[PDB]
Every structure is written in structure tokens, then in C-alpha cells.
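Subject: Interface between my chains keeps coming out wrong

I've been trying for a while to get a sensible model of this assembly. When I model each chain on its own everything looks fine, but I need the whole thing in one frame so I can look at the contacts. Pasting all components below, labels as-is. Any help appreciated, I'm running out of ideas.
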Amino acid sequence: EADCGLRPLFEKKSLEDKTERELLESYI
Amino acid sequence: IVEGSDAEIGMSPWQVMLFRKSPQELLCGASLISDRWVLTAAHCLLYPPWDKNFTENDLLVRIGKHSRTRYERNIEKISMLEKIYIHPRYNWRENLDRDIALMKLKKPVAFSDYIHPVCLPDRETAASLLQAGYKGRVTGWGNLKETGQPSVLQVVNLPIVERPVCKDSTRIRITDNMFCAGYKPDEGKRGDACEGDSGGPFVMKSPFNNRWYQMGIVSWGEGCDRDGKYGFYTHVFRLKKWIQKVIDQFG
Amino acid sequence: DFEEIPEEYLQ
Ligand SMILES: C[C@@H](NS(=O)(=O)Cc1ccccc1)C(=O)N1CCC[C@H]1C(=O)NCc1ccc(C(=N)N)cc1
Ligand SMILES: C[C@@H](NS(=O)(=O)Cc1ccccc1)C(=O)N1CCC[C@H]1C(=O)NCc1ccc(C(=N)N)cc1
Ligand SMILES: *[C@@H]1O[C@H](CO)[C@@H](O)[C@H](O)[C@H]1NC(C)=O
Ligand code: NA
Ligand code: NA
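Reply #2:
Try treating it as a single job with all components included. I did that and got this:
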């Protein structure tokens, strides 16, 4: 709950997945 | 998922597979929202027009998976269902309005690198992110084409579509408890959920707090990845009061 | 199509 939505292999280690930037770029 | 790609390891650690005990087969997708609660589409469990009415003992939940068909020893965890809760106003008769269900697990699942819950949106995050053109992400082990099946979990990013466009794409009555997503014919790019992706999550990564939120549940669509058609998703925030009521009462 | 799962989960 407290750490919901933070992925161990990505957000928790400050790594980005290959296409998340596509989402960010759409949030104009 | 049609016209998507293989997921990365641990890319969607809230992804759940609903698995039929006999015969052993994929039933639907779903998502992990806490150590004891799994969210899915009501039509995954109850759809009388197709003689579908699953009970707790018919099913298993498989969490932490990547491969569709393999038993992923030391990685996936398999859970039994304590109780299913279907929205009391789920409209299976007409248009799948309020297509949402919760499943309480018999025992809490241990979180790991591959198993971790997604957030549910609050009103503000929903208002900020559920806008035409903003993209979310759908994942699942469903069909690769409308009319085959993937080796591993598939992923596709898709833009939310303006409500009038959603409405004008179909003869079915759309409600405020649904939204639609996908590319338009003129946009070139494509992609869609499909049969078997049912019940899985449509997620968005908040640019405010860098957390993933589940905004939708794969609900319905006319075929898969057809030009001029869109995928329809249960609007999770609109039904959150019911979600909270169930968890508060039975959790 | 699917690999068999440990029997403990089917009990
Ligand atoms: C009565 C209604 N049946 S229905 O669409 O399957 C009902 C339904 C709608 C949305 C989600 C889940 C269930 C229907 O056939 N309608 C509603 C008004 C016009 C006509 C239609 O064109 N529906 C689209 C459609 C229907 C069936 C199928 C299919 N291959 N099963 C595909 C598209
Ligand atoms: C309205 C109806 N259309 S349908 O064309 O029959 C759905 C369908 C597509 C491909 C293979 C088998 C079924 C539908 O979507 N229904 C009827 C009752 C349950 C729901 C369903 O199948 N949902 C699964 C689903 C299918 C397609 C999509 C998509 N985004 N294209 C999403 C969910
Ligand atoms: C589905 O199964 C439940 C429990 O076995 C039953 O009570 C119900 O009447 C069935 N049909 C529904 C919910 O439409
Ligand atoms: Na219409
Ligand atoms: Na389309």
C-alpha cells in the first residue's frame, strides 16, 4: 500500500523501462 | 495483446493470471492491489450468455509470472481464492456496465522483485491523467490476433480517446463507468487488448509522484485491433467507492 | 499447452 506502484526492478532502483517515456511524453 | 511487444522482466509486477483448475488453462488477467486482494473484470467470473459462472474453488491466481505456459519455479506464486465479490450492479445483460470484481486470497502473498501491488487512483490523479491523448499501458497473455498465443507477457501503450469518438465507434451504449483507448485509423500506429487479456490492468505512471496507477480494467471490444474500433475499459476510479466498501467490510 | 503445476495447489 505505502509502496504501491513502485516496481522493485525499476522505480525502486531508479531504472526506467524501455517505453515508459512514451507515456510521459503524452502527458502534455 | 495485438501489436504489442514482450514485457521486460518485472515490468508489471502486479499482473495476475486467473487460472482454471480443470481443464488447466488461462481464464483471464487480473491485478494485485494488496497482499490479499486481486482486482479483475466481472465478466471473467460471471457471464450467463456464455454459461460462465465460476466459483472460488474453480480457480487459482498465479502471481509474478512472465511465461504464459511455464510453471515458473521459485518466481511465481500460486494462491487460492477465499471469496469472490462481483459489483452488485454489474450489467451482464446489456453492455457490461460496472465490469468489476474483487477476489480475496486465502493467504497473503509475499512480495518480491516480481510481485508487487499497483496503486488505485484517487480523485485528483484520475482527473489529471484520464484525458484524451494521454497514454496508458495494457498487459496480458491474451491472443496476438483477433482470429496465436504469446510465449510471454505482452505489453502495449495506447492513448485514451475522446468520449464522443468512443461513442461514435460503436452501436453499444457507453456509460461513464467506461472509457476507451487506442489509435485512430489516421494515426498509423496500432495495438489493442484481445480475448484472454480480459480483467487485466490499464495503468498510467503519474508524473507527479512517479507511481503506477491502475486506471482501467480490460473489459470489451468489437474484435481486436480493428480500424475504427477501440478497446473499452472499466473506469476504476468511478467504482472505487465500491472497492473500498468491500475491502473495509471483508478485509 | 500449460506445464503442470505442483499438486499441492490443486488439493
Ligand atoms: C445485443 C448486442 N449484443 S452485445 O454487443 O454482444 C452485448 C455486449 C456489448 C458490450 C459488451 C459486452 C456485451 C448486440 O449485438 N448489439 C448491440 C447493438 C447492436 C449490436 C452490435 O452490433 N453489437 C456489437 C457486437 C456484437 C457481438 C459481437 C460478437 N462477435 N459477439 C461483436 C460486436
Ligand atoms: C462485445 C463483445 N465483443 S467480441 O467481439 O465478441 C469480443 C471478442 C473479441 C475477439 C475474440 C473473442 C471475443 C465483447 O467484448 N464481449 C462480450 C462479453 C464479454 C466481452 C469480451 O469478450 N471481452 C473480452 C475482450 C475482447 C476484446 C477486447 C478489445 N480491447 N478488443 C477487450 C476485451
Ligand atoms: C451463479 O452462481 C451462484 C452461486 O453458485 C448462484 O447463486 C447464482 O444464482 C448463479 N447465477 C448468477 C449469479 O447469475
Ligand atoms: Na454510437
Ligand atoms: Na482500432
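Reply #3:
Confirming on my end. The longest helix of chain B spans residues 240-250.
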